[PDB]
Design an enzyme around this catalytic site. Structure first.
Site, PDB file in Angstrom:
ATOM      1  N   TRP A  48       3.020   5.226   3.686  1.00 53.35           N
ATOM      2  CA  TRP A  48       1.415   5.577   3.761  1.00 53.35           C
ATOM      3  C   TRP A  48       1.464   7.103   5.133  1.00 53.35           C
ATOM      4  O   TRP A  48       1.765   6.571   6.358  1.00 53.35           O
ATOM      5  CB  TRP A  48       0.620   4.703   4.647  1.00 53.35           C
ATOM      6  CG  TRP A  48      -0.290   4.662   4.677  1.00 53.35           C
ATOM      7  CD1 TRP A  48      -1.275   5.175   5.268  1.00 53.35           C
ATOM      8  CD2 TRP A  48      -2.018   3.310   4.891  1.00 53.35           C
ATOM      9  NE1 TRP A  48      -2.650   5.554   5.140  1.00 53.35           N
ATOM     10  CE2 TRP A  48      -3.366   4.070   5.492  1.00 53.35           C
ATOM     11  CE3 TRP A  48      -1.542   2.633   4.602  1.00 53.35           C
ATOM     12  CZ2 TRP A  48      -3.668   3.449   4.890  1.00 53.35           C
ATOM     13  CZ3 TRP A  48      -3.021   1.411   4.797  1.00 53.35           C
ATOM     14  CH2 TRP A  48      -3.894   2.271   5.156  1.00 53.35           C
ATOM     15  N   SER A 108       8.695  -2.614   6.542  1.00 56.66           N
ATOM     16  CA  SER A 108       8.584  -1.309   6.550  1.00 56.66           C
ATOM     17  C   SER A 108       8.478  -0.943   8.185  1.00 56.66           C
ATOM     18  O   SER A 108       7.711   0.151   8.332  1.00 56.66           O
ATOM     19  CB  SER A 108       7.481  -0.520   5.853  1.00 56.66           C
ATOM     20  OG  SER A 108       7.413   0.330   5.785  1.00 56.66           O
ATOM     21  N   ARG A 120      -2.217  -0.139  -3.013  1.00 59.77           N
ATOM     22  CA  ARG A 120      -1.025   0.640  -4.051  1.00 59.77           C
ATOM     23  C   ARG A 120      -0.613  -0.548  -5.393  1.00 59.77           C
ATOM     24  O   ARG A 120      -0.123   0.063  -5.569  1.00 59.77           O
ATOM     25  CB  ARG A 120      -0.443   1.717  -2.713  1.00 59.77           C
ATOM     26  CG  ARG A 120      -0.902   2.177  -2.073  1.00 59.77           C
ATOM     27  CD  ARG A 120       0.239   2.604  -0.891  1.00 59.77           C
ATOM     28  NE  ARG A 120       0.300   1.087   0.365  1.00 59.77           N
ATOM     29  CZ  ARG A 120       0.963   1.169   0.959  1.00 59.77           C
ATOM     30  NH1 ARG A 120       1.427   2.401   1.329  1.00 59.77           N
ATOM     31  NH2 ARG A 120       1.247   0.584   1.927  1.00 59.77           N
ATOM     32  N   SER A 133       7.091   6.329   4.524  1.00 62.73           N
ATOM     33  CA  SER A 133       7.869   5.496   4.880  1.00 62.73           C
ATOM     34  C   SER A 133       8.528   5.280   3.312  1.00 62.73           C
ATOM     35  O   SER A 133      10.037   4.957   3.166  1.00 62.73           O
ATOM     36  CB  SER A 133       7.506   3.727   4.657  1.00 62.73           C
ATOM     37  OG  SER A 133       6.396   3.784   6.009  1.00 62.73           O
TER      38      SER A 133
HETATM   39  C1  LIG Z   1       5.538   4.408   6.033  1.00 63.26           C
HETATM   40  O1  LIG Z   1       4.688   5.355   5.446  1.00 63.26           O
HETATM   41  N1  LIG Z   1       4.856   4.164   7.563  1.00 63.26           N
HETATM   42  C2  LIG Z   1       6.079   2.807   8.290  1.00 63.26           C
HETATM   43  C3  LIG Z   1       5.209   1.540   8.098  1.00 63.26           C
HETATM   44  N2  LIG Z   1       4.682   0.697   7.358  1.00 63.26           N
HETATM   45  O2  LIG Z   1       4.358   1.091   5.820  1.00 63.26           O
HETATM   46  S1  LIG Z   1       3.896   1.175   3.969  1.00 63.26           S
HETATM   47  O3  LIG Z   1       2.772   0.157   4.081  1.00 63.26           O
HETATM   48  O4  LIG Z   1       3.361   2.272   3.944  1.00 63.26           O
HETATM   49  O5  LIG Z   1       5.245   0.467   3.951  1.00 63.26           O
HETATM   50  C4  LIG Z   1       3.642   2.078   8.532  1.00 63.26           C
HETATM   51  C5  LIG Z   1       2.297   3.313   8.833  1.00 63.26           C
HETATM   52  C6  LIG Z   1       3.461   4.330   7.547  1.00 63.26           C
HETATM   53  C7  LIG Z   1       4.281   5.542   9.400  1.00 63.26           C
HETATM   54  N3  LIG Z   1       2.804   5.565   9.614  1.00 63.26           N
HETATM   55  O6  LIG Z   1       5.001   5.593   9.383  1.00 63.26           O
END
Ligand SMILES: *C(=O)N1C[C@H](NOS(=O)(=O)O)CC[C@H]1C(N)=O
Length: 243
Positions: free
Chosen positions: A191, A98, A229, A51
């Site tokens: 993540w 996100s 984090r 993300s």
């Molecule tokens: C980003 O890495 N993602 C989108 C969503 N929110 O993420 S955060 O906590 O890392 O800001 C869920 C998980 C993740 C994904 N699996 O795409």
């Protein structure tokens, strides 16, 4: 308070140790990179951006006029992975939450070709997005190292990326996540669930207007909450007197 370097290094390694993971936090003052944490060799290894890619995804969409910062992305009514995503939002709200479906929509509006071309022009990570415009940042082929991520954050914090000043200012206003005694923290977490990587990449803007970029990169383990984090990053930045 005249603390040794050995002691800063030891306190920060122990934040990662106490969270029972392996990770690094890279800090940049001026042109100088300092790596802290419990797995220093992570600094120049490649990971999916996950993300953290939303930040460049927004820059690219806004530059090429695929969205405005006022535009409401309607929830289409499908069950989404978290309830917080089942609502209509702006790019900025979606950054805070996100929200993948908003960012996938924006990537599809950009389209594979303009996306491939723009990721090359800004020279992000290994710059390879494969054939799939709406998941490349999560499962390959796009990869980036923690050093490239703080350098990226450094560029954006100082408006040096190849995009209009206003586009950069528009994306940055979306990234404010914390205010601590006159400091502001701007950042995006990541993540890679698709060993799972965890990021928190950003900068602190200090009262005096000075900006210190950072990228935390660690391994997310079974039943760890996303907020370690943040906890590790806040603890490291305070230990170093950056906030
Ligand atoms: C980003 O890495 N993602 C989108 C969503 N929110 O993420 S955060 O906590 O890392 O800001 C869920 C998980 C993740 C994904 N699996 O795409």
């Amino acid at each position: 308070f005249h603390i040794s370097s050995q002691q800063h290094e030891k306190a920060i390694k122990s934040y990662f140790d106490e969270a029972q993971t392996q990770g690094v936090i890279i800090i940049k003052e001026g042109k100088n990179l300092s790596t802290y944490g419990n797995a220093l060799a992570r600094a120049n290894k490649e990971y999916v951006p996950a993300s953290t890619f939303k930040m460049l995804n927004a820059l690219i969409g806004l530059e090429n006029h695929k969205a405005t910062t006022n535009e409401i992305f309607k929830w289409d009514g499908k069950k989404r992975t978290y309830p917080m995503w089942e609502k209509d939002m702006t790019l900025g709200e979606a950054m805070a939450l996100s929200a993948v479906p908003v960012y996938q929509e924006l990537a599809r509006r950009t389209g594979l070709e303009l996306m491939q071309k723009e990721v090359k022009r800004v020279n992000f990570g290994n710059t390879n997005i494969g054939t799939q415009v709406d998941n490349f940042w999560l499962v390959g082929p796009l990869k980036i190292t923690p050093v490239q991520e703080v350098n990226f954050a450094d560029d954006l914090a100082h408006n040096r990326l190849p995009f209009k000043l206003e586009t950069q200012e528009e994306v940055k206003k979306m990234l404010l996540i914390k205010e601590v005694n006159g400091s502001k923290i701007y950042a995006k977490s990541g993540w890679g669930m698709g060993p799972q990587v965890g990021w928190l990449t950003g900068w602190v803007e200090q009262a005096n207007g000075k900006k210190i970029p950072f990228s935390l990169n660690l391994e997310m383990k079974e039943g760890m909450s996303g907020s370690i984090r943040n906890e590790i990053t806040y603890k490291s930045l305070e230990n170093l007197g950056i906030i």
